[PDB]
Design a binder for these strands. Structure first.
Lengths: 197, 100, 117
RNA sequence: AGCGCAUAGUACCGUGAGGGAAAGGUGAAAAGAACCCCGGGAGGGGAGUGAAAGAGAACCUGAAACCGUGGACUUACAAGCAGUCAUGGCACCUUAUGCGUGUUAUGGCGUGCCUAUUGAAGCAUGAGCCGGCGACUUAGACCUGACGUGCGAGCUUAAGU
RNA sequence: AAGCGAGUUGUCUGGUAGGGGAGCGUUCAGUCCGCGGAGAAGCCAUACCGGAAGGAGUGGUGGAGCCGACUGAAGUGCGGA
């Protein structure tokens, strides 16, 4: 059993229980991603006297219902509104348990997703990205999906940055941030593969 | 020669004048089916006696589909606060109908 | 954040301005005598197609009262003549029909008139 | 709108330190325009310019109280701010189908909304209109509690890599 | 694979402080194969449907984009202070 390319062809390692499906209790890893990594700023308004001006006023009780006495209300056009969005630094922790399995749950029915074992490229020489990526044609992988990327090299794993095409950021480990992004999940590094470690 | 009668309610003159009707539970959805029971009105050629022996012979009507609906929103309320609203889900078939 | 609804609140006023009927002056594009006159068109308008029976009720109680008095007639103290046939039941609408054939009470007079003894 | 400044905190308010505007936008590009008219000129003609000049030399599209005219229809002898329906009444027939569209003498009668009010329909008050602002929320192991989930022996701060 | 009811009987009352509960849509963000030159988005009007709010049929005009379903966020909505 088990399909593969570049190297050999086999498989029996597993870990990760994964019954039928019933997955998706990882939505708090869809805002934490932008909380343990996010720049709050807003329009910035909470000050009740950002204006900083004089005091006293006209005849608060005369003429035509003054309703004066300085300017401390969100009425006069040209100021703020008092109280509101202050910088904020995003304070959430996200349970540290569900992570090395919640990911496995993202393989519930995503199992169909392409996955295997490999090492960059063997039918090539050094590095120059051309017919190396073009090798990804021995399976229709050059304009049919999205391609997941991981590897363990940082010397030849940076030559594919686009706006709508592929993504790339590697650290040689796992990341929910990139587990559906590229439809066929393909880690494989012979250095930091599916290891539960 | 003309037509009056009951069922559903009373809103007639039609003998071929074509007017929208009401509905029925089961037995709908399908061009024509025919339905009848007893009668009440008649007139006829100077012979509309009552609504008692308004049976005897039967006169087979038609029954169309269900005809869209005069959709609206509704609104009411006086000096306070604003709430409520509940659509008219009526069907209103057509029923060709034909004298007998 | 942000919204700027300095254009969306147009169709709102109009979605109700549907009733820009012949009111007064120019109460069809007013912006006063519209969303107010609408609140005026917001009364028994709700029940202005049912309660109306009371209005058209003021019809058959002049005709059904005593039309062809050349018989006997009474209507009121005669309704006990109506529901005195085999299967009377029905009543109005058939009054609206009574506006057609005058022979709606020929042999339908003394066929309830003395239908007592 | 956003700091008041998207080239002004101009002029200034003024008794004094001290308070201040409002305001942006033509298309890529002005090519922001010779040539006869009324007229003092402003403003308006021809005609190129203009891919497109119902952009238009105080200029995108351009909704609106007020405001500009006519027209199919009704109206001063009929009475109530307004109403909805109600037979008629002139018009139209984006499907002859005695069926409707733009409507009115008149009839039942019928008194507004907001909204602090026991309480009204009020003369109880708020309201000429247009355009926006339109508020119990934001950080806080501040706490209790519904649901989904983590576990039954349970859950983590400070940042160090 | 997120729960749903005809068949039927009483309740389905009207509701002011309130309880459980559905949404129309705009701005921010996901996936954008996308939708638009016959030109959409800006807007003006036509009797389909919707529990109301509103979603629909087409031109008009207008000039370059714009929103969608599953989703969370936002100074989310009185003409009326």
């Amino acid at each position: 059993a088990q399909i593969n390319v570049i190297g050999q062809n086999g498989g029996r390692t597993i870990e990760l229980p994964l019954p039928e499906v019933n997955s998706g209790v990882l939505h708090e890893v869809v805002t934490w991603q932008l909380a343990s990594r996010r720049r709050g700023t807003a329009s910035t308004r909470t000050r009740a006297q950002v204006s900083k001006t004089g005091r006293k006023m006209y005849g608060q009780k005369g003429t035509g219902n003054a309703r004066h006495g300085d300017r401390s209300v969100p009425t006069f056009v040209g100021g703020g509104v008092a109280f509101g969005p202050k910088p904020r630094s995003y304070d959430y922790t996200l349970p540290r348990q569900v992570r090395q399995l919640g990911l496995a749950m993202a393989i519930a029915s995503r199992q169909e997703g392409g996955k295997l074992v490999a090492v960059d490229g063997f039918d090539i020489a050094d590095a120059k990205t051309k017919n190396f990526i073009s090798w990804a044609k021995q399976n229709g992988l050059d304009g049919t999906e999205k391609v997941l990327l991981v590897t363990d090299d940082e010397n030849t794993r940076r030559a594919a940055r686009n706006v709508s095409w592929v993504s790339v950021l590697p650290v040689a480990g796992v990341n929910v941030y990139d587990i559906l992004r590229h439809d066929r999940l393909v880690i494989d590094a012979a250095a930091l593969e599916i290891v539960e470690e | 020669m003309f037509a009056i009668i009951q069922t559903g309610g009373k809103q007639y003159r039609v003998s071929e004048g074509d007017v929208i009707r009401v509905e029925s539970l089961q037995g709908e959805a399908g061009d024509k089916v025919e339905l009848k029971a007893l009668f009440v009105g008649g007139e006829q050629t100077v012979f509309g006696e009552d609504a008692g022996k308004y049976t005897v012979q039967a006169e087979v009507v038609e029954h169309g589909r269900g005809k869209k609906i005069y959709i609206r929103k509704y609104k009411s309320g006086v000096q306070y606060r604003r709430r409520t609203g509940h659509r008219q889900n009526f069907t209103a078939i057509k029923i060709l109908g034909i004298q007998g | 954040p942000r919204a700027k609804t300095g254009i969306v609140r147009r169709r709102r006023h109009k979605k109700v301005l549907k009733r820009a009927k012949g009111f007064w002056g120019s109460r069809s594009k007013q912006y006063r005598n519209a969303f107010q006159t609408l609140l005026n068109a917001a009364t028994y308008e709700y029940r202005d197609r049912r309660n109306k029976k009371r209005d058209f009720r003021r019809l058959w109680i002049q005709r059904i009262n005593a039309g062809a008095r050349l018989h006997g007639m009474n209507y009121s103290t005669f309704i006990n003549g109506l529901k005195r046939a085999n299967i009377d039941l029905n009543r109005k609408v058939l009054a609206d029909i009574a506006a057609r054939e005058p022979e709606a009470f020929k042999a339908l007079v003394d066929a309830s008139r003395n239908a007592r003894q």
